[PDB]
Symmetry: D2
C-alpha cells in the first residue's frame, strides 16, 4: 500500500488514515486499535456465564485501567482524558506526580512557560483545600491519595477538568506520588507557618487497586508514557501477570498486548477516534 | 488553549489543527512550518539585488535540500517525497544506503515483510543495470552515485517513483553509501560469477554537492531522521526521534508529522521562481 | 596523552588511571571525584563561622545525600553502598521501590535470575514484619517509610546489609514508593487472607527530608541512575546512562565508574568531623 | 556473589574483576570474553580437516574483523587498537569517517578541544599526500579507501599510529566514508586552487571485504559503537548471515554472539586484558 498522494489535494481524514496504514509503527497502532475495541466489546462466553455463581452481582465486562504521565496532562491530551472519564469509558486511572495539579491549574488560566500568578492561584487553592480538611474533616485518621483526589474533584466543580468528572462518575484515580508534586510543596509551605496535621496513607490505595484487578471478570490496561504503573497486575490467582488486554504507548498466559513506539499526544487522539469515540462499551448486564 | 473535544464529533481537520496547538512538540512543528514557508517564499532584498553582477543568470531564490534516511523510504513518506520532486519543491536530495533500492522495489510489488519474489525481481533489475553500465563506463571518469541514480531513474521510467521524477526534473540525489545497500549485494553476487568491473567514484559527487551550496544565493535544509548529511544553512528544519540562521529541531517521528507539515507548506505555498 | 599501552603488560592500576585520563567521559569522571572530595573536606570560612549564633550545636560540615535506584541495589554496588553507610560517609539516602527488599534478599541467598526459595524466604520475612508492625502502630501517627526501613534494619541485624548499618549509624533512608515494590506485594497477599491494617504515612517523611536540607550548613548530593529525587545543592554529582553550585553530569554506567570514584574519594579522603 | 568490599582496602585488580562478576551487564561482558577467546583459539575439527582439498593453502583459523567508530579513535582506545594491529591480533578493520585522520593527528600533537594549529598541520600533511599522488602515482585509475590508507600508513611511518602498523602487518582497513571526513575537506580545499584529479572507487573495496568473508574458513566479528559495518556478512553460500563468532559493544545458524550494552572505552580494555593480551592466537598452520 502507498502513502498519501498530495496530487489529490488535501484531505485530512485520508491523511490520518494513510498514517495508520503506511506510517512508521502503523502496524502496532492498528493492533492497539483492535485491542482497545476488544476491551470495550468483551462479553462472557456461554461457558463462562455458567461459571458465575448465584449472588455474583459484578458487571460481567472488561474493567479498563487508564495510566498516563503528568506530562500528558500538560498537553491537550488532558481534554481527551476528560472526555473518556466524562463518558465512563474507563474505570480507573493511575497517574504520576503533578498530573492532578495541572488539571486544576488549567481551570484557572491557559499555560503558554507557566505564568507566576497561575502557579500562585493554584497553590492558594490547594492550600485552602488542605486547611479546610483540617478545620472540618477529622484529621486523626489519614486520607489516601484517591480519596483526596475525589474531594478535590468535588470541590473544583469544573466540567472541563478530569477530576471533577472522575468524582461525578465514581472513577477512582490513584496517584501514590501525589505528595511529591505541587500538592506536597503546598504541604511544606503550609507547615512552615501552621503545623500541617494532614496524613497520607498509601496502603489503602494499594489494597483498592489490587482488589479491583483480583476481583474483576476481565482486565484491560492502557498506559501512556513511561513510569506510570506496573504492567504486571495481580490476577485472581495471586500471580502478578499481564492483563487480558494491554496497550502500551511511549517513546521509550493468553494475554493480548502491543507496545506502540510513538508519542501519545499525537497518536492517542487518532486511536481514540477509532475506538472510544465510535465503539459502544458493553454495559456488563447479562 | 484546550486540546480536541470529542464531544464535538470526529473532525479530522480539527484533530490535526488541535495537535498543532496542544500536542507535545507542537511549538516546534509550528516553527518548522514557518521556516519551510520562508524557504519557498524567500526573495532578495533591493540591497541584495544590487550586489548581483551583470551576467549572473542564477535563479534568485532559496535552494532547498531534502535529506531522509532509507527507513523513511520504507514508510509511506516515499510517496510524499515523490510528490515533492515531481513538483520541483526541492532541488537536491541526500539519502542513505538502501533508499534507492526501496523506491525501485515499490514499483514492482507492495511491501506488507518483503516477499521473496519481490526482492528477486528488484535484484534482477539492479543486476541488469550494473552489467549494462559496466560496458559504457569511462574508466578515466567513472560514474558517481548521483550519476548512477539519475540513470536508474531514467531506466525505471515509473511515475510512482522518486528517482524517475528526480531524473525528469534534474534533481540530483546524493548517496555516498549506495554500494553499502542492496545495490552492493547485487555487485557481490554478480562478482562470484564473472568479476565485476563497475567502478563508483565519490570525489566528483563531493565536488558536485559543494558547488551547489557555494553557488546558491540562499540555502534551505530539511533533514528527516538521524545520520544523513554533514555540513550552515540560512534555514534549517531537523526532524527525528533522537549567525542569522533560522532553524528548529523537531523531536517527532517524521512519517507522522512530516505529511502534516507538507500540507501546511509545500502543498499550499507557491514557490518563488527566482526570476527578478 | 595516550591510552593504556598493553606492551607494558597488564597493570590494573595503570588501566584504571589510563581510563580516568583518556576514556570517553573521563573529564566528567575527574570532576565528579574533585566535587565529592570537596563535599568531604568542606569547612566554614572564618567569615562564615562568625555568622553562627551561640547555642548552634550543629556539625559545621557538608551534609551528604546519596541517591540510587533499585537497579543499582541488584548489582554489586549494594556492597559499595553498605560500606559508605557503615563508615558514615553519607548522611541520607533516597532510593526507589524494590531497593530495600533486594538488600534484605541478598542476606538470605545469592542472586545469579532469582531462586524461587529466595523470594519465598524474603516474602516470609517481610510478611512477619508487616504483621508485627500492625500490632504496635499508632493510628494517629502511622509509621513512615523511613521509620519502617529503620526498624527493618534493626530487625534484620545483618552486617552485610545497607539497612542494618543505616539504622546503626542513624542514616535515614527515604523511599516514598516503598509500597510499590515487593513490600507491597506482601501486603496484597497478606490482605487476601486477613485484611491488612498497616498504614504508611508520607507527609511526615516529606517533613523530615525538608528539615534536613533546611537545617544543614552545606549540602552535597550524589545521584546514581534516573528517576530518584526531586529538589539546589552546593555540590552535586549526577551519574546515569540517560548560582555558585558546583556540579557535573557523568554519562556512564554507575556500577562500573562509581567504584572507581569511591576508590579516589570516600576510600582515601578523610571526612571533616564538623567540630569547629 | 557480592561486589567489591572496600573494607579490605584498595585493590584495582580485584575492583576490575569485581565488575566482571557483579556489575551491570557483567554476564554479557563475560560471554564477550569467552567468545573472543574462541575466535583466537579456534581450530578445524578432524572431520573439518578432511573436507579441505589439496592445494587449499589458506590459513585454517578464524579470520577476525575489528570495527570501531571514529569516536573510539579519539579516545585512548586508539592505542589499544594500535596494540591489536601491531601484534596481528586482527585481520581486517572497518571504521568510519574521521578515524584515519584522528590517528594521524595524534602523531603530531595531543588533543586536549582541538588546537587550531593541530588541525592545520594535519590538513597540510593530508594535502601534501594528495598532491604527491597526483605528481608521482598514476591518476588515470582510481584508488580505493583501503589502498589510500595503506599508502598513508607507509608515508606516516610512526609506530604509535594504527595505520602505520596496519600497513606493516598487511591488515587492510576499510573506510567507505573516507571522503566524508577531514580527508574530503582537504580534497575540497585543494580543488578550489588546483583541480583535484584524485578519484576514489568503492566497488573494489566492496569486493575485497566480501571476498574475504566468503573465502575464510571461520569468521569472527567485533564491533564497537553504532553505525560501523553490517552485522550480517556474506557466507560462502552467498547468504548474508551473522558471523560464526560475534561481539557487539555499544551504548545503544549456529552463530555464537553477544550484545554488550556498555561504553567500549571503559569495558573494551578490560576485555582485551582477558583475551588478546593473554590468549595466544592460533597460527592456522595445520
Ligand atoms: Cl466495570
Ligand atoms: Cl534553485
Ligand atoms: Cl552532618
Ligand atoms: Cl587469517
Amino acid at each position: 500500500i502507498k502513502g498519501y498522494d498530495f496530487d489529490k489535494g488535501i484531505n485530512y481524514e485520508e491523511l490520518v488514515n494513510s498514517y495508520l496504514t503506511t506510517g512508521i509503527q502503523s502496524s502496532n497502532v492498528g493492533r492497539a486499535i483492535n485491542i482497545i475495541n476488544k476491551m470495550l466489546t468483551w462479553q462472557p462466553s456461554e461457558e463462562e456465564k455458567k461459571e458465575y455463581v448465584e449472588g455474583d452481582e459484578r458487571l460481567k465486562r472488561c474493567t479498563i485501567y487508564l495510566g498516563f504521565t503528568s506530562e500528558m496532562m500538560t498537553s491537550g491530551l488532558r481534554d481527551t482524558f476528560r472526555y473518556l472519564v466524562e463518558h465512563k469509558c474507563v474505570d480507573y486511572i493511575v497517574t504520576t506526580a503533578g498530573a492532578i495539579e495541572t488539571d486544576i491549574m488549567k481551570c484557572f488560566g491557559n499555560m503558554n512557560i507557566i505564568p507566576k500568578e497561575l502557579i500562585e492561584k493554584t497553590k492558594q487553592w490547594l492550600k485552602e483545600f488542605i486547611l479546610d480538611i483540617q478545620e472540618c474533616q477529622d484529621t486523626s485518621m489519614p486520607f489516601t491519595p484517591s480519596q483526596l483526589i475525589t474531594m478535590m474533584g468535588e470541590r473544583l466543580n469544573d466540567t472541563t477538568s478530569v477530576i471533577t468528572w472522575a468524582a461525578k462518575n465514581n472513577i477512582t484515580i490513584f496517584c501514590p506520588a501525589l505528595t511529591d508534586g505541587l500538592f506536597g510543596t503546598c504541604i511544606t509551605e503550609l507547615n512552615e507557618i501552621n503545623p500541617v496535621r494532614l496524613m497520607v496513607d498509601l496502603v489503602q490505595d494499594l489494597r483498592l487497586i489490587n482488589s479491583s484487578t483480583i476481583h474483576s471478570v476481565e482486565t484491560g490496561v492502557i498506559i501512556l508514557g513511561g513510569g506510570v504503573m506496573k504492567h504486571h497486575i495481580m490476577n485472581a490467582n495471586l500471580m502478578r501477570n499481564e492483563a487480558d488486554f494491554a496497550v502500551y504507548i511511549n517513546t521509550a498466559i493468553d494475554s493480548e498486548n502491543v507496545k506502540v513506539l510513538a508519542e501519545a499526544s499525537l497518536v492517542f487522539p487518532l486511536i481514540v477516534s477509532k475506538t472510544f469515540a465510535v465503539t459502544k462499551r458493553f454495559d456488563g448486564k447479562i
